Each structure stands twice: as structure tokens, then as C-alpha cells.
Design a protein around this nucleic acid. Sequence first.
DNA 1: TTCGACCGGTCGA
DNA 2: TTCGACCGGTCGA
DNA 3: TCGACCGGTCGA
DNA 4: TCGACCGGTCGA
Lengths: 289, 289, 287, 289
Amino acid sequence: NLTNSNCVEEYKENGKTKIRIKPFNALIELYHHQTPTGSIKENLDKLENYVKDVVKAKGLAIPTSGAFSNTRGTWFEVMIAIQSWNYRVKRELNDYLIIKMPNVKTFDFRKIFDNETREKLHQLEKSLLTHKQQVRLITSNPDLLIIRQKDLIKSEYNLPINKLTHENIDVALTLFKDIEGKCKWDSLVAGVGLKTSLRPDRRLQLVHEGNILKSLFAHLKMAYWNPKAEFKYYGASSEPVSKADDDALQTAATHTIVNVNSTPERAVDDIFSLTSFEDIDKMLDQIIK
Amino acid sequence: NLTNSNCVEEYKENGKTKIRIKPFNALIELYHHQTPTGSIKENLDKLENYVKDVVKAKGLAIPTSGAFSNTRGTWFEVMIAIQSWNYRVKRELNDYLIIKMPNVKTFDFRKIFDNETREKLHQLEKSLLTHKQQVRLITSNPDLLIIRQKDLIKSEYNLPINKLTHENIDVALTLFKDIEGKCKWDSLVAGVGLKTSLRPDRRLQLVHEGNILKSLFAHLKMAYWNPKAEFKYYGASSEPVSKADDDALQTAATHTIVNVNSTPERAVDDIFSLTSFEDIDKMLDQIIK
Amino acid sequence: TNSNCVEEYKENGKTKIRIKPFNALIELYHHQTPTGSIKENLDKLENYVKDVVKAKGLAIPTSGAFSNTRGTWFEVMIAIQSWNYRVKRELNDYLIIKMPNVKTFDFRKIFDNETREKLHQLEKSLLTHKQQVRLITSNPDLLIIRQKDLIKSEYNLPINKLTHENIDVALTLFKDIEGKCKWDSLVAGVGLKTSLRPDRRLQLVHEGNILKSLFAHLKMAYWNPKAEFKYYGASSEPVSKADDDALQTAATHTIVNVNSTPERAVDDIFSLTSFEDIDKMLDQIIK
Amino acid sequence: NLTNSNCVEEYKENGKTKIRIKPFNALIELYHHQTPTGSIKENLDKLENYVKDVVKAKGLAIPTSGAFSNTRGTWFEVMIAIQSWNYRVKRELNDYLIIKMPNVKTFDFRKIFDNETREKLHQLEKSLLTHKQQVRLITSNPDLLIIRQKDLIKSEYNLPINKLTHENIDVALTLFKDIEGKCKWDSLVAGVGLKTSLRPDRRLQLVHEGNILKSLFAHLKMAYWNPKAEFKYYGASSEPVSKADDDALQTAATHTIVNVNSTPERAVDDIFSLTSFEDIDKMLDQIIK
DNA sequence: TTCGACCGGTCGA
DNA sequence: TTCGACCGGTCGA
DNA sequence: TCGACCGGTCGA
DNA sequence: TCGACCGGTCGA
């Protein structure tokens, strides 16, 4: 029956036949009866070998690492997205949302804000571009956003996802649409960058991400002159985090160490090593409370 | 013939036979007649095809795309270090040095500084760790460092490298050792991140680099209360830079936009698309002046 | 003697003599607005009083009873002199207002509802600390506003004689603008002093510092780098290099970073010898 | 015996016969045997009468309150400089000095610093002048300086002053000379502005004082990147301090409230109402610890 | 078709 | 070994 | 000439 | 009562 799987799709491109992995089909096809749990890494290899056996059975050629790197990325994100969906359900956080975000083009995360907040950000933008050396504040959407605003929770969000289905995955991955233009600037409490693995270079992308996000938030705090609002950014790896990874992720928010009296603040507040799905819950516990 | 090449080396690891690319040997072997010129890519391709032909001849396994990623980066950097070495020579700057840097563990770039400057850095970095929330300022060594300090130029540096040889390469790649602990903080004028290609995520590593580097420099300027001193960071790609790449690289140094009065500054001052070796000269012209 | 420049009030069965500098202005200028030497015109108002008592059977008002009065007079002169300036200058979108004390009318009141709010945000925030902090300074003697919709045709009628109303209309100009000034419509403030002392001069650096500090926060709330406020000083006497140096003290908040470009609390100090100089000063201030 | 006292003086101011209150001698005569104690407020009035009785007696006119205001202030600063000196004696702070400072011209307080610290200040004050809009950091010397540096205490400072005599007063008023060029920047812990009375305008001179002093200290902290060092400025009045006086003296250091996260600070940390010599000790107790 | 964001497989020290 | 820094091959929108 | 002090107001 | 003004010193 593997020859019937859809985790891989064939197509021609410029007369060239190519095979494409469909990460969601592999998910749906393996977890439609119960949602994954246990060791996250095993689930990633399980999903990967599955795709490899399906392709082997279809008589197609094993996808390149590039394909698997991409795919594994998605798998990791969705598993975390679903686990987060259920997390707030069983933890009964009726004023919190943990959203898996799309890329910045599909939906620039700045869109989640109410119009007053969107105006302040525009103020700053147009301003930074109004110079000899035009300046911007760009960063990829954070993988996960954690919002705390009661009036945004719809009763349907309280229905746990107990199996991976086109429908269930879609509701999780489109949850972001519901909050568009409705969040008060300080309703945003934290962001999380997800990475199946780290590298001396890639891990720095987390620091950049937390830095630009916290720089934006810092400007909203001044706009609304509110020193108590706080935004934290976190990183999560499915593998062990070395000391080197740790130190790197302790990098200060350059805008927070300008002054000798200024208090240091890390771009990435904390890095989590998620070995099991239970750990996702523990991480969220530490992030949210 | 090719079966005699050394661009590829075989070895066993845990009873498993593996083939390793030796990027330098491919360089030396393809350019001991004359140093590369023209289209940077056609050259990088030429260097890769050569690694594959030697592999088919040797009967060995065709190296993974991950092995050609690592390697290709090594080639780009090297092909540049050489062009820059002869650049300063053919343009005549007995006060400028363009150094290809090793990784931060082999030689933390902070070591290029004299004892007084390195102490100011210690003060800061020791201060940042002296908090409940420990903070650091970590970034990979910039690929290229441009120093301007007359007393550091040795007459040997004026001997152009006209062919790639174990020595021609080593002298270029060990040039950094000579200046250890001898640079005055403001002798450092610019850094350059080199990348054969960009990606929406990787390109942000340049912004992080420039940001942390400029943050450190900003603190030295404070330390020596010298508003004149500058440090600029640049990015160089061997491929076309899209409008998206551009905008992303216009990201400001968060620590320069804290105040409504603070003049915005870019983490990466400019991004260069280097199609030919002549462009490397043009880039350097704009950077140095 | 029939004059009202002076008075004689009861204070614990110890009859004392007060001066109503106002009358000593109208009663000495119902004719016309003084001009020429600010120095000499000041004494004219003083001898007019040194007499009202020398022929009314009274005693000499203390050096200080006059210091107070000598100040006022000085002020009203510049104050009234600025009215005939805007008019005889064509500054229809400008107002030069002689401010009352911060109690009578806290200058923060000149701002529209949105601006006054931002200020509340801040000054309320500053009080929300274990160590409560404030941003207090006496109202600047003179305020220069630039907002077209605040000019009323009556402001264009020059004052060519000092009368209870000419005074009263000037010393109340601030009322018309209350709660009507956009934040960036404030262009400058000026400190007036007949003389300067090494200690008293530091009050202008403070005045300007607290004013600029405030305005600075208005610039950040509206993220508008362009807007700017300036503070100036004015002595009816010479200014020594020590007064100049002291008055060069930049804003401690404008020199925090070795990159931030410095600014002075008091942008410039003017020595006004004649009424002709008041116009010159205003010319430089208004740009 | 009054008609020969030295508390006054008749100098020739272009013809006119003028009386120059000679303040120091008026203390030395009322206190030729013991230190003034009990009530400051009162002790001031008597000092005023004695000198106000050596006048009419000698057939002269009671010098103008102007000369008295000038005179009165000094008596206050002097009495304080004395109780302050004996104060560290009875308490025995063998590493503390409470110095009555001369005007900034006679001895610019910046002179108390060692070479290195004076250097840093020069950097700054030279930099500020290097602009289109020349800027300075000027303030009158603080009335009282409190230094904490063990190696500056000479055994001779431990001999309490029990009576006001020319030699005594002068040892107290020249104590500042001893420490010239010897203090480490952070050895300076607090300054105190003394005023027999306050006024809505004059009290703001205290705020300016503290502000400029704290601004300078702030730059030294930067210079030596030491966030631990702290300088406090206080005000002391011989009369009751109204709520208006209080609020005014609550004005913050414009340079500590530039950022929303910036933690606000007062130019004048606290204002003391000194009714008795008893209170001078109490004030110092607070200040010093 | 282009752009966004993902990461795994190195070679060298 | 592990740690530093490199980047090319995706799948989705 | 300059530094730093403050007490005696007039008005609200 | 509180706001803001400044002129008359004594010393260096």
C-alpha cells in the first residue's frame, strides 16, 4: 500500500521530472488515529524513514537532504503547533493563544496589531526610511507567537486536536488569520523560534530574531510610554543544546546595553532542548508563567 | 591524470570508508599556473566540476551537496582573500590590510587589539556576565577584516600572489597571526561577510554580525569618548542580490535607533553582488576609498 | 503724590508701604510705551515711586521691595515691546506671550488635549517609583508660539501707550491660547533677568533643561525628529564670559551617548541695552 | 569692649566711608572659646546681633541685609563645616572626609581627582567644546563634599575643633587643599548644597547643581564602566521645607529619564531642614550610610 | 516565477 | 570527538 | 572682576 | 502661603 501514499508527489518542471515531498500527507498518513507523543526526534526519523520507504516502494529516488531539511522543519513546527493547541486546552488558559505563524510575506506578523498600534509602527518605519542611508527593521516572522488577550479566544479553540487531519492541521495553521488586526500591542507576550537542530551560524538567527522583535516592542513601549509591558523571545531545539549554543544565545540585545546604567537583556531569553512532547508542555509552562 | 588529484581524500571512520573533499588542493591544483579571474561562478563551478571529475576517475563516491556547500564557501573566501591581497598591492596602500579571518575559536578577532583596547572589552564583557541574567556579545569572526594601521604592514605583504600554492594560500590565511595584539581599536575600519549565495534566513546572519560588531565598536568609541571613529560592515554575494535581500540588509543597528534623535544606522552598510573578480576590486574601492 | 504707584497697608499694627508697580506703569505711561534705554526707563519708574513717597509722607521701600518691582517693570517692557513687534513685523502666525507664574497658569496648559495627555503619561510614570521623581521648573518668562489658528485680529492692534488695559490685555494673552497649542507649535522660550549673578544664572540652564527635557519626550511620543524647541536668556546688562560659559552648559540628557549630538539648555544669552535690542533678539530667535 | 571688635571694617570705596562685615572674625569672637551648638536658627540670629551691636555702638549703620544675606550664608556653611569636622571625629569615620569647598574659581572641585580621572573629564569637556554649538558642564562647587578614601586621612584631622579660632576656621576651610589630585573618581560619594533659606527660584539651583554633578559622575561610571559606583547630592536648609520646596527638589536628572526602561533619578536625592546642630549629625548619618 | 524559512552534511582546527 | 562557519536543495504560498 | 550667598518683596 | 524677582554684599 506504500505505493499509494501521497507523502511524495511527482511533477514535471521544464520537461524535467521531479519528486516533491508533501510533509503534511506524511503527517496525516501516520497520525490520523492518535497525535504523536514520546521522543520528538524519533517521530522525525519515523516520518523521514516513512517517506523513504514510501518513495522506495513507489520506485522513486530518495529525496535530497535539502528536501528533508525543509520537511523536517515543517514537521517539527506542526507537532509543536498542535501540542501547543492542546497545551492551553488541558492547562485551561482561556485568555492565551499560541500561534504557529506563516512566513512574513504570507502574513507579516505586524498585521496582528490593532490599527492604533499599526500606526505607531508605521510612524517608526516611514521615519527610518526618511534618511540618506535608508534603514529598516526586518526579520522573519517568529515561528510561534504567544498572545494574551481574552476577547480573542473563540470556543472552537477549546476543542483539542486528537488526530492529524487535513482539517485539523489547517485549523492550527490558519489560527493566525483570526487575530489579524485585533491584538493590542502589549497582548503579545512572547515569541519562539523552533529549530530541529542548531549550528554555530544558524543559532545566531535566533539572536537576530529576538533582537529585532524586542527592538520593535521597545519602540511600542516608548510610544505608549509603558515601562512594565514585556516581550520575551525563546528558542527551542529538538536536540541537545551545547554550552557553546548556550553562550551564543545569551547575546545581549544591543539596544539594551548602550548605557552603563542601562540593564542588559538577552535577545533570546532562554533556549529549550525538547526531547519529548512532554517537554513542549514544560517549556510552555515556563514561558507562559 | 585526475586519478592523481588530491582534491579528494579517502579515509575510514568507525570501519566506514568515507571520501573527503580537500578544497585547498582543488584550488592549488587548478590555479598554480595563474590566480583565478573573470566570472566568480564559472570559476566556482569549474572548481566543483573538477572535484567531481576527479571523483569519477578515482572511482570514488560523488560528494554530497553538504560537502560542496562547505567547500564552495572555502573557495569563495579564498578566491577573495587573494584578490584583496594583490588589490592593496596594485592600488598601493602601505597602511591597509585586508585579512581573511579564521573561526572565532581558532583566533577570536578580539585578539587583534592592543592590550589597552582588549581590557576595555574585558571590562564590558565581564560586566555583562555580572548579572542575575548573564549576557554576552557573541558573533562568529567576520569573514574579512580591513585594518588601517601603517606600522602593521610588512614589506612581504607587497609581494603579489600570482599562483595558488600551499604557501601562497597559507601566507594569506595566516596573515591574521601577524597583527595579533597590535591593532589600536580605531585601526579597525570595516568587516565583510562573504556568502556565495543568500537566503531569507541566512542573510540575516550578516545583520546580526554587523550589529554585534558595531555594538562592540560603539562601546570602544564610548570608552575612548571618540565620536569620530567609525566601523562599517559589508556583505558580499557571488550572486544577484534581490530587492528582498536589499531591504533585509538595510536593517538598522537596534542600538542606533533607541532615541528619536539617534541617527539610524544599518547593521550592514551595503551589500555587494560580485559577478567577476573585477567587482571585488570595485567593492574594495567603495569600502576603502 | 496724588499718584497710586505706592500704597500703605496694615501688617500687625506696624504700618508698611507696598508698591503697586502696575500704576507706576500706567500712571507714567498712559501717554505712550517707553522706548530707548531699558536701563534708564527702569529708573524712571523707580524715581516716580522714590517720589510718590518723598512727597506723601512715607518711607523708602526696601532694596528688595524694588528688586521685585524692578523685575516686573523690566518684563512688562519686553512683554509689551513684543506685541508692537509681531504687529510691526508681520508675524501673523506667531505669538510672543508673557507668562504668569506656574501656579496661576502652569504653561503645560497651553497644550491641546492629546499633548497634555502624553505629559500626564510621563509625569505620572515618574511618580510611580520608590524614589518619586518630577519635572518642575518655573514658567518661562516668555513663550513664542507658532500656530496660525491662534491669532485673533485684535492682536494686530499695536499698544502705543501703557494703560491698565494695554497691560491687562498683554498680561492675559496666554488665556486665549490655553488648551489650544499643538505640541510642536511651541518654538521657543525666553528667560528674562535685569541682571545676572553666578548663582542665579544657573536658573536659566535649569529652566531650559527642564523645558527641553519635556519637549524631548514630546518629540519621542510623536516620533518626530524634526521639531525642536529653543530656550534663550536675556539680561538688561552686559554678559561676562563667565555668564556665557555658564550658559553653555548643554543638556545632561543630550550628552548621554558619545554619539548623541550635544545641545545647550540655554541656546543663547542676550544683553539687551535698548528697546532696539529686544527687536534684534526676537529677530534672531524667530529666525 | 564692643567698640573695637573686628567683626566690621571701614574701607574707602571712592570717598564714601563703608563698613565691610568681616564674617570670620564675628565667629571667632562669639566663639573664641567654644563651638556653636544648640540651635542653628538661633545661633545665626545672635551672630547677627553681636555684629549688629558692634555697629550702632561704633556709631555706624547696621549693614544692609544684602551684606547680611551674604554674611549669614557663610556663618551657616562654616558652622556646618565645623560640626561636620568634629562629627567624623566623635563618630570616627577613619576613611571619610567632609570638606567645605571654596568657589569653583579658587579651587575647581574637579581638582580633587587623581590624574587618570582628571584625564577622562578633560576628554569629555574637550569633546563637548568640539562642536558647532559649543557645550560645557558648569556648576558652582558643591558647598560640602563627602569623600571616602582611607589614604587621605591625616591624624591631624582627628583633633576636634572645640572653639572657633583663626587657625581652626582656616584648617577647616583649607582642608580641601590636602586632597587635591588625590581622590579616585568613586571616592566621591555625595555633595551637599547649603542654604539658610529657600525660594521658588533659588531652590532650583540645587537641582541644577545635582544634575550637572550627577551628569559628570555618570560619565565617569561610563568611562570606568562601573555601574556600582554612585554619587548622591543633598540639600540642607536652616528653615522649614515646604511641600512646594519638596516637590521641586524631586526633579529628576533629565539624563536618567530619557528612556522608558531608564530608571529615573533625582538631581537632589534629599532635602534636609536643619534646626539644630543635632540635625547636622542626623543628616550626615543618613548621607553617609 | 519569485520569495520566505527550513536545516543537514560537511572540512578544518 | 566536538565546535566553528559554510551553503545549497527544497515545499509552500 | 568673578564666585556664591540670600532675604525682602508684589501678585495671585 | 506660594511663585518668581534681583540687588547688595564679603572673599578671593
